[PDB]
């Protein structure tokens, strides 16, 4: 089991971001449930 | 009586010409984006 604090970077329009490992995350950094953040981009199922 | 030249009204035959020197000016270095900024604009740095 490995836990790593990493820097994450996102470019406009901020529909995805990358980690220091080079792994992409195909979700907006600003995705959420409040203030209309549920309209932000996600490429993953809701259970993820 | 006796007078000084300051006691006599003075009119001028001279035509005025007021030439002033162009002043020194300093040009500071100025860049819109530093090369560090240009390097950092990439999302993923392969070397890092």
3-state secondary structure chain A: CCCCCCCEECCCCCCCEEECCCCEECECCCCCCCCCHHHCCECCCCCC
Q: What is the dihedral of CA A30, A36, A41, A46, to 10 degrees?
A: 100
Structural biology method used: cryo-EM
- Minimal Cα distance from B47: which residue of A? A22
Q: Do A20 and B48 touch (CB under 8 A)?
A: yes
Structure resolution in Å? 2.1
Contact status, residue A46 vs residue A37, Cβ threshold 8 Å: no
Q: What is the spatial distance between Cα A23 and Cα A6, in angstroms, rounded to a whole number?
A: 11
Q: What is the spatial distance between Cα A28 and Cα A8, in angstroms, rounded to a whole number?
A: 12
* A22 lies within 8 A of chain B by CB: yes
Contact status, residue A25 vs residue A18, Cβ threshold 8 Å: yes
Bond prior to A13 in cis (omega within 30° of 0): yes
Q: At residue B27, what are phi and psi to the nearest 5 degrees?
A: -100, 110
Residues after which a C–N gap over 2.5 Å breaks chain B: none
Contact status, residue A24 vs residue A43, Cβ threshold 8 Å: no
Q: What is the dihedral of CA A36, A37, A42, A46, to 10 degrees?
A: -80
Tokens describing residue B13:
């035959």
- Minimal Cα distance from B45: which residue of A? A22
Tokens describing residue B1:
């009586």
Q: What is the spatial distance between Cα B2 and Cα B7, in angstroms, rounded to a whole number?
A: 10
């Amino acid at each position: 089991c490995i836990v790593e604090e990493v820097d994450a970077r996102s470019v406009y329009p901020y529909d995805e971001f990358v980690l220091a490992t080079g792994d992409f995350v195909y979700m907006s950094p600003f995705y959420g449930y409040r203030e209309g953040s549920h309209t932000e981009h996600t490429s993953y199922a809701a259970d993820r | 009586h006796q007078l000084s030249r300051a006691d006599v009204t003075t009119v001028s035959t001279f035509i005025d010409l007021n030439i002033t020197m162009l002043e020194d000016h300093e040009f500071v270095p100025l860049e819109v984006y530093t090369r560090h900024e240009i390097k950092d604009s990439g999302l993923l740095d392969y070397t890092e």
